[PDB]
Amino acid sequence: APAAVDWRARGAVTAVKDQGQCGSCWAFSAIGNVECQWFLAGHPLTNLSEQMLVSCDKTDSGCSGGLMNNAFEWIVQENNGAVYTEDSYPYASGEGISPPCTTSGHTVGATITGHVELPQDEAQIAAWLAVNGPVAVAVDASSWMTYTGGVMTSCVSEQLDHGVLLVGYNDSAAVPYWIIKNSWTTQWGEEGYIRIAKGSNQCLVKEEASSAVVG
Ligand SMILES: *[C@@H](N)CNC(=O)[C@H](Cc1ccccc1)NC(=O)c1ccccc1
């Protein structure tokens, strides 16, 4: 694997979004992954719908929580692999209110055929990310409220509570780090992003890493 990767520089990552006052990070993580994978598949970078998952995906629990794996599963097995555009199915749960599911007239932004899980190994995850793009991961963001910038090194790593997106790493730095996309606006952290120490399983980052498959 390369010494450093940043898929943002490859224009493969969309703008930082805002989940608002809603427990829908799982949806943002999954959808982000699908966005990046769709671009890297040879298609235009399209903003996709988190609201599709929050409202329609009943395997998960809307604004109270859910799982990225469950989202990919639901997309393939229930929604024929379709991921709608954010433009034709916009996010509306910003204040905590989830509209009902609508299945007439929406526009398919991406089409996935499956998903893969990555080993609980930062090296193997990086090895994947360097080739096939950004990875949906679960973390312990309990100590993230106070993050303002820099490489976090003593992140509270107890129990998973947040869904974020690995978009790259840097093994060349004095302290090697993961570059992580969050869904807490651009005011938080490093322009919406956060760098965490790589190799010491910070925030339990290596626990649940998955990626969609765009056949
Ligand atoms: C983010 N603000 C919403 N939080 C959750 O959805 C929360 C944490 C989470 C971790 C990994 C992947 C997705 C979400 N959900 C859970 O703790 C959880 C666990 C088991 C079943 C449902 C929800």
Q: Share of helix among residues?
A: 10-25%
Question: What is the string of SSEs from the N terminus onward?
Answer: EHHHEEEHEEEEEE
Largest beta sheet, briefly?
Answer: 8 strands, mixed
Number of domains: 1
Terminal Cα separation, in Å?
24 Å
Total number of β-strand segments? 10
**So, the CATH homologous superfamily?**
Cysteine proteinases
- The CATH topology name reads Cathepsin B, Chain A
Radius of gyration: 16 Å
CATH architecture: Alpha-Beta Complex
What small molecules does the structure contain?
N-(2-aminoethyl)-Nalpha-benzoyl-L-phenylalaninamide
Q: Name the shape in a single word.
A: globular
PDB class: hydrolase/hydrolase inhibitor
Keywords: Thiol protease, Hydrolase-Hydrolase inhibitor complex
Assembly: monomeric
Entry title: Crystal structure of cruzain with nitrile inhibitor N-(2-AMINOETHYL)-NALPHA-BENZOYL-L-PHENYLALANINAMIDE
